[model samples]
Target: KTLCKSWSDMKKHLNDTVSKSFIGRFFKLEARKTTFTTELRAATATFLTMAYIITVNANILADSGATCSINDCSTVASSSPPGPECVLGSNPGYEQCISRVKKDLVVATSLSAMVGSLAMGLLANLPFGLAPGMGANAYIAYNVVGFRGSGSISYHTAMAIVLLEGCAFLAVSALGLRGKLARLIPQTVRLACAVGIGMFIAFVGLQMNQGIGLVGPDKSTLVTLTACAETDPVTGACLGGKMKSPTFWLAVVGFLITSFGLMKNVKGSMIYGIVFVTAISWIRGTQVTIFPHTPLGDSNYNYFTKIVDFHKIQSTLGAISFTEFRKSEVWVAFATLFYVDLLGTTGVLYTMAEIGGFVEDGKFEGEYAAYLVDAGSSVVGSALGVTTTATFVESSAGLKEGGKTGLTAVIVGLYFLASMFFTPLVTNVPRWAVGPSLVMVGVMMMGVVKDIRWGETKEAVTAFVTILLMPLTYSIANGIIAGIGIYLALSMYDVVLGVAKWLN
Candidate 1:
């Protein structure tokens, strides 16, 4: 009886300490209100849903070809450096350089995400996860770097542009212009943004699956089929080329499971779907002797040491000179980053705010603070050797689980910090596993489509353009610009008609 009383007393003391903690009061656990358990559970759900970003970001940002070498260490310093170099664009240890750079990027990505999340939690008191946005990172690595298209800019120069973009975002958000711009966006357009983003994410998920491949000799055709008898699966001649393959079925099972879980309202349905799919994939791969039976045990798990490298980012800090900015292509790139972040960030935060119950009567209550966090995170992300960091739509996964306060962000930040210690293990989570969650998230976010007006021809047409072009053009910036252009033109036409009616 005495022992039991002492145990009860200890529990009471612990609860009191937690209740009186700085974070507890700062986030207003009692004043703003929620149980500690709820916050933790929601945070955990958010972390699991979005944790795939660690691998995805690192992979996206890492040097693809012979872009780094040990010789680069001499000029750039061991602590920090830019891309790989030997002499005249030749590096002897190209493969080794790629491996090390990939590892370093893994560390950079993790630390940057942690910093961004913490800032959002502590400064803005919002339940949003911040990270190097997937599309933006791809844009920086592939498009700007000349890996994919015509225009080619140096790596540091691209980073410099991102830095400038972040500064621009910060300035606009501080001047209250960003919030005003968001307010000016029509409600129908906002709903269209959500639908557009959903389709974009789903398209990304489809791209991740090996069953789907870009077809045609120049890869100019839409991927709409599972297979073609004349096409080669390994040669990218068909969409869903591996439809008969085990991996394809694995992903299908995951998508089906995720859809079922959501319909049933199972808690953490996305995460569960991913885990279940991963397990099935592993088992089937092992049975075929294609995948290792003990992928984790056989894997080399390396914990991070030099996780944050400011020197790498510092190398690119101001690489964009006035001469470079004078070029039309450079100006276009900068404009692309600015407009994409403005529209994307505003739309995402507003949608997430509604999901988190922070909106009423079509006005988002915490929008100003949230925009500050979004732009501030981008600045921090650029400085830490990553791409544009923005508020993630994945925060909806947590909001679905009842994350309503800064505590949820804090918890996700802590998880990112812990991710550094388990870098190898975290990085190895299969693409197939994470891919399903993206598709399911797209499914869930499509709920906003209900709010879009389908009867009005102008609104319906613009919304359709917004939703279709996002995935079809493979550019969120393009889709949003098209939607905005149509919306403004139609709105102006209506106003002119109204003025004519008044004059009559």
Candidate 2:
């Protein structure tokens, strides 16, 4: 009751008043049975786990060559596991531009996540995090547009596809098929879908180019373990240096540290796990260094020292093109993205509600609003040259911390905003650093297998098709189509019979 109070006492008074005022009443903290500090800690944990996406998404999307239209470097069609053999010293022009776009994507990813995280917390009022999803970006980078835009569809066209995909998804969410649409998907397929995506992600991590250099391009068997320094140019097979790559060993080091960190239940174990490997690679005097002595590496290290910088989008910003719509390839890619995102976004969002104990009668209060934000976040990714965005399962870390409201998401959103400054460091991480972490991530997503109806042989068949083909075909789009075709073939009759019998 004193007019003047001590600093400590006044601070407590301030919190109490604010808690009872807009922050508390708006978030319904008491109603939710949570607290200011608890939500803060929860959101911090969410941000830590969610922060890894900033690098992984940019790294994966960067593999697509993200509008770096430089013809100076020729494709290594003949090289072992042949690809565009652009290197820093050999192909400075293309590599330099590639780095530029790569960092731009770093900024783009954080911005999209920033917008999505905040909107979900502020509007949807859920403790969730949204970023360009691992599988969705993998789908675009490897399957749809391809490495260096190698796929038939261009990156711009793919961007347009994402915009259209989000528009379609948002419409469904708005019209309220939100749950009913996910219902269209069979349960086994739904569970298997995540594993397929995880497999797709893990498979990418093992490859020579985008991953840890463990798996190299093969001619006869398709893919073989060839983590050697000397590879045969003709077949892209390992000639020597087996398990000798400094990059591979360094990545393994990170994986070990990361795994132990996880075993210890560290909140941002994955996030720091990636950061540790990245920072170690940043130093110039090491063979495992991400910044090599090449022209491209030198330039990147120069910028890397900046530590705090912002990069504007060079090629991908405002680059979405609609002309590709008439082409079959555009729709072909979009079709895969459609169902993948439907489950990735809408399906995943429900889990957040369910985990937070917000679900009521198979629904939650902010369910529709969360869907709207998730869909809207997808559109933002398109605008920023990233792929589809989804509510991250990593947000579950926050829920485990007792985060039950939008405030957790708001804190994570703020961190995303803060993350935009770290583009140089985050985007600079080498592929090897990303590979092992992806395998770990894949392991987690693949954990969904336990929920599958493995007892039913027919369902198991569809699940196998969904999971295997997504990685082997290197086509999440084609993979889902095949699985859905098989699912409908096997299950449509059962559904028809069951429905007719029920009606009778």
Candidate 1 achieves a global lDDT of: 0.65
| Decoy 2 TM-score against native | 0.90
Q: Which ranges in model 2 have alpha carbons more than 4 Å from their true place? A: 1-14, 71-89, 218-220, 231-237, 491-504
Please report, in order, the local distance difference test score of every candidate based on alpha carbons. 0.65, 0.78
**Which ten-residue region of model 1 has the weakest summed lDDT?**
208-217
List CA RMSD, all candidates.
Answer: 6.9, 4.4
TM-scores for the candidates: 0.73, 0.90
Clashes of 2: 1
**lDDT string, candidate 1, 1-504, tens digits:** 799899677765765677688867777777645656678888988887687677666655553331453344333335643342332232224433444555567667777789888888877778877888855765566457643212456566677788889888888878877656766767777778767777776666555222222123334554554423334533335433335545556666777887886676554566666567655644433532224534332332232223332323222232344446666667678887776677677666777876766778865556667777777777776655678887777677788766677888888999988777654444344655665655665676788788777999888988998898888776666777898898879877889789899997
Query: In model 1, where do residues sit more than 4 Å from their true spots?
Result: 1-11, 21-30, 34-38, 60-99, 134-154, 207-235, 238-242, 269-323, 347-369, 396-405, 429-434, 488-504
Query: What does candidate 1 score on TM?
Result: 0.73
